[PDB]
Design a protein around this nucleic acid. Structure first.
Ligand SMILES: [Cl-]
Ligand SMILES: [Cl-]
Ligand SMILES: [Mg+2]
Ligand SMILES: [Mg+2]
Ligand SMILES: [Mg+2]
Ligand SMILES: [Mg+2]
Ligand SMILES: [Mg+2]
Ligand SMILES: [Mg+2]
Ligand SMILES: [Mg+2]
Ligand SMILES: [Mg+2]
Ligand code: NA
Ligand code: NA
Ligand code: NA
Ligand code: NA
Ligand code: NA
Ligand code: NA
Ligand SMILES: [Sr+2]
Ligand SMILES: [Sr+2]
Ligand SMILES: [Sr+2]
Ligand SMILES: [Sr+2]
Ligand SMILES: [Sr+2]
Ligand SMILES: [Sr+2]
Ligand SMILES: [Sr+2]
Ligand SMILES: [Sr+2]
Lengths: 140, 95, 160, 154, 186
RNA sequence: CCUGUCAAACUCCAAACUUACAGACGCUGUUUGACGCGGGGAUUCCGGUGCGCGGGGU
RNA sequence: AGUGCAAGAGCAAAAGAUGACUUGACAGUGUUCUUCCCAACGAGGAACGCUGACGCGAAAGCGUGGUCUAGCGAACCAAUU
RNA sequence: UUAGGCGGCCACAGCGGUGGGGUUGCCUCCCGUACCCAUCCCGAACACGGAAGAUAAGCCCACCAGCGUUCCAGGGAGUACUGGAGUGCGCGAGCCUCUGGGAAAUCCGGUUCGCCGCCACC
């Protein structure tokens, strides 16, 4: 009952929103894998007349590459209560977003016979805080 | 009419009721009809290809062979006999 | 211009403002009169002005009949008196005038009119029992300024 | 079985209505036909309702009308009991009249003209501008009402 | 759902089970469909034709009924997939089915995958199915040589239940031999 | 929430009715040959009115 | 939402978006509808075939230009293959 | 169908909700990257290999009507509108009678929480 209901780290998205590149080298040193460029839609008046152009970079970390990052990323910032999603995810800062979920998330991410996760099996903000508090740091 | 194009005055007949919107079921698009069979002519708004002239919507013709995958259906427009090239997607069997 | 040119329902419904431009504003200043904070169910007496013939009543006639009706109620019951009158019809029908002979005859936009069917309530006033004969007089003045003959019908009131 | 009689002429009458009367074997004013009560025939009299007078006749009245106005398919010949005896599947006018009313046969099926060419109404009819319910002579009649008309048109 | 104008998808689209656009292009051939479906533990292969009230299956084969002929090995792999296709294809030849078109459903057209193995098996059984040779796996991977060379990196055994130690892809050969023989009870 | 109105170029609805094909009845055709096909000759292409439905216009 | 442009219509594992590849916007010849309801009339247009050669795809299949309805021109003469 | 596959009709099937169900069985979540294959970055997905664990998801089974939807009853309504007819009424816009058809909104009460086909399967 409790084993298939206890949270796990799905992905740690480390992103850098610049606007105009040179920030790719420092991400690959702190994370462990390769980063990808980020484009943008709609013409903006802040000298952004090009649609398909490198504005930022992101890194999606999974499994061991995620936990070995969070052991050195979480003690760098003070986690608040209002910093949580309605789904139970948190973002701080270099933007570091952590997507937390229950063991049956493949059902909404697979190709064949996919279904959206029920509101009861969806993670709560309170149930998310309890998991991180139980792993080397304080809440509030 | 203000213009004499094929799709003139066809707002009603070539539009779907909101619930019949989206891609149509494949079953009726692959239906096989035999020569001599009486078929009803009605354009499916969701299917672009294999259509006939909208003036012929509502006709009940007779299948008299086929041209490729499309059918050659004989109708009588007023008093004039015409042969219509039409795919199964726009045809329904009588009864 | 006389009402003889616009009183009948002889043209199609011409209301679509997305295809019609230059429509004159409505001369109707108010639609909710008296005490618009109080409810219609808070009054014992409900008297309506019923139109007998199917007609088109212009915004100028609506304002004239409403003004001559409400002005009597302001005179007899006071400016902040215990009554509430409603003009339920709005001038939706846009009117033209051909003002060149019969060539390019589609007229320019000159006004608006309210299509009221026979048997319908144009005005409806809610008052007390002692103010009932003052409102029947306000409607007597109001029917003289519109095109058809009218009925002053009491809907809620067996106090006679 | 109803008895149709044309009371209004062909001029200004709709072509599809005039054609229905011709399909019901009635081509002139005052001409009568004996029509069965089926779904198909009901649609036809309803279309002709305003130019006709119909209703179920009594055995007595039908017998009087057949005696005086029935004609063979071809010829002048009187349709009396002896004629009915020699050419029909019946014994007398009564046997024919009963079969017609019970919808067992038709006048044509028995070698008689489908049309009973009646005489104008003696003492006149109730009028060709109003129906029976309004005091006129058009539309559906009572059995007593159609009898008065057919007997007046002997 | 929200109101009268709301358009609820077709049932098999709502369930995310049928790609209706691919289905039409598949049905355009006029030939029966070789429905190649997978599961985590098993592999299915059906020969489906078109019917008035729904689809008609003329000859099927699941990897569970493979054991009926002598398969003591697992059922969700490459050798299993080929043999399930071969079994479906042979049952099809007895039903009168001579030609088919490969339906992979919502599975990916990845080179050398299990659904292409199901196809290679059905063709080898005598069915005429439009294929591409270089999209199919090399004969040794179909045998299960990739699983044997994975058991060479032993230390800890690959299979939990006792079948063998170093794995026998020779069982594939001993199964294709049994099915190619006409004396078999289908 | 409550309360007041609308649409030739709006529609969750929706007639009467018009309309394709077929069967049945009716009527019609097989000496009055219908339906249809081919050919000769036209006249005609200022129309009007009633009624129903209209559009423009006081 | 988007889908080049009126308006109305079509489209969501797409007809839209991104990416990659590609040149079928191909040659030849028809059937049919339209142009011109019924009901004769050209150019033009469209749908649907076949022959040839290709592109893409695992394949069915899709591609006879742009999701559909506008974007068009006789004889004579010239140039061109 | 003690949980499967392919479907037809394409909301009566939607939205939301409650309860129940899985030792060598089924579907899953699940476990895992040597390979076929894969991510413009991630075995997340796709692909492949596999069973330590689980019924919490999904899925299957039973059920609830609050919203949406289908059909039915009664009321609205034979009202609105309407094909045919009239030396019927009205100054007139228009109405009426006879005949043949006949709504919509809304309210109340029921129904609907899919039906059916082929295949496989203690
Ligand atoms: Cl056509
Ligand atoms: Cl599958
Ligand atoms: Mg229209
Ligand atoms: Mg004679
Ligand atoms: Mg006299
Ligand atoms: Mg008289
Ligand atoms: Mg010249
Ligand atoms: Mg030149
Ligand atoms: Mg459960
Ligand atoms: Mg008069
Ligand atoms: Na890039
Ligand atoms: Na559709
Ligand atoms: Na001028
Ligand atoms: Na003329
Ligand atoms: Na042409
Ligand atoms: Na479960
Ligand atoms: Sr007018
Ligand atoms: Sr007056
Ligand atoms: Sr019409
Ligand atoms: Sr096209
Ligand atoms: Sr994994
Ligand atoms: Sr007069
Ligand atoms: Sr007057
Ligand atoms: Sr009725």
């Amino acid at each position: 009952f409790h084993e298939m209901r206890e949270p796990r780290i799905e992905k740690v998205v480390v992103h850098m929103g610049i606007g105009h590149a040179n920030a790719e080298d420092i991400l690959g040193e702190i994370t462990g894998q390769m980063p990808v460029r980020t484009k943008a839609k709609r013409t903006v008046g802040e000298f952004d007349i090009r649609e398909g152009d490198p504005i930022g970079a992101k890194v999606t970390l999974r499994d061991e590459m995620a936990e070995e990052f969070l052991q050195t990323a979480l003690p760098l910032a003070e986690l608040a209560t209002s910093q949580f999603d309605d789904t139970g995810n948190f973002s701080f800062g270099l933007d570091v977003t952590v997507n937390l979920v229950r063991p049956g998330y493949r059902v909404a991410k697979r190709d064949k016979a996919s279904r959206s996760i029920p509101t009861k099996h969806r993670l709560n903000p309170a149930d998310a805080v309890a998991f991180i508090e139980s792993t080397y740091d304080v809440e509030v | 009419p203000s213009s004499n194009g094929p799709l003139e005055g066809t707002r009603g007949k070539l539009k779907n009721k909101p619930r019949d919107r989206g891609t149509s079921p494949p079953q009726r698009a692959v239906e096989e009809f035999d020569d001599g069979e009486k078929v009803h002519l009605k354009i499916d708004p969701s299917v672009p290809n294999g259509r006939f002239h909208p003036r012929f919507d509502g006709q009940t013709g007779t299948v008299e062979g086929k041209q490729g995958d499309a059918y050659k259906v004989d109708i009588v427009d007023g008093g004039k006999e015409k042969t219509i090239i039409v795919t199964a997607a726009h045809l329904r069997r009588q009864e | 211009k006389p009402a003889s040119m616009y009183r009948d329902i002889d043209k199609p419904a011409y209301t679509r403002r997305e295809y019609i431009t230059g429509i004159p504003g409505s001369k109707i200043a108010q639609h909710k009169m008296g005490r618009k904070q109080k409810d219609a169910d808070d009054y014992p007496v409900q008297i309506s002005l019923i139109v007998e013939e199917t007609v088109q009543l212009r915004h100028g006639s609506l304002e004239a009949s409403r003004l001559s009706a409400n002005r009597h109620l302001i005179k007899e019951l006071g400016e902040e008196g215990d009554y509430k009158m409603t003009l339920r019809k709005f001038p939706h029908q846009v009117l033209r005038e051909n003002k060149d002979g019969m060539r390019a005859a589609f007229g320019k936009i000159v006004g608006t009119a309210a299509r009221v069917q026979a048997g319908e309530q144009l005005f409806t006033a809610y008052c007390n029992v002692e103010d009932a004969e003052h409102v029947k007089e306000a409607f007597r003045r109001a029917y003289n300024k519109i095109t058809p003959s009218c009925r002053i019908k009491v809907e809620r009131g067996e106090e006679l | 079985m109803h008895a149709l009689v044309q009371l209004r002429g062909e001029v200004n009458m709709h072509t599809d209505i005039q054609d229905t009367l011709e399909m019901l074997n009635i081509h002139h004013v005052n001409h009568c036909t004996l029509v069965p009560e089926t779904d198909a025939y009901r649609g036809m009299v309803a279309k002709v309702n305003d130019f006709v007078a119909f209703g179920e006749p009594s055995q007595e009245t039908l017998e009087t009308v057949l005696a005086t106005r029935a004609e063979p398919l071809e010829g002048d010949a009187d349709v009396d009991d002896e004629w009915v005896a020699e050419h029909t599947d019946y014994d007398d006018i009564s046997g024919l009249a009963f079969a017609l009313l019970s919808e067992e046969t038709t006048l044509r099926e028995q070698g008689l003209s489908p049309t009973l060419r009646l005489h104008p109404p003696r003492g006149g009819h109730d009028g060709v501008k109003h129906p029976v319910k309004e005091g006129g002579q058009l539309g559906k009649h009572d059995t007593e009402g159609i009898d008065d008309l057919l007997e007046a048109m002997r | 759902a929200t109101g009268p104008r709301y358009k609820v998808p077709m049932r098999r689209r709502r369930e995310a089970r049928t790609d209706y656009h691919q289905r039409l292009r598949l049905l355009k051939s006029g030939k029966p469909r070789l429905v190649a479906r997978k599961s985590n533990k098993h592999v299915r292969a059906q020969l489906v034709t078109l019917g008035p009230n729904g689809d008609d299956t003329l000859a099927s084969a699941h990897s569970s009924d493979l054991a009926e002929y002598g398969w003591e090995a697992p059922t969700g792999n490459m050798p299993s997939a080929y043999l399930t296709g071969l079994l479906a294809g042979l049952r099809a030849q007895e039903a009168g089915v001579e030609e088919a078109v490969l339906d992979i459903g919502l599975n990916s057209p990845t080179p050398g995958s299990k659904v292409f193995a199901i196809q290679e098996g059905a063709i080898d059984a005598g069915l005429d199915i439009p294929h591409n040779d270089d999209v199919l796996a090399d004969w040794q991977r179909t045998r299960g040589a990739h699983i044997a060379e994975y058991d060479e990196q032993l230390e800890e055994p690959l299979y939990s239940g006792d079948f063998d130690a170093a794995d026998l892809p020779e069982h594939f050969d001993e199964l294709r031999e049994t099915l190619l023989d006409g004396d078999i009870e289908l």
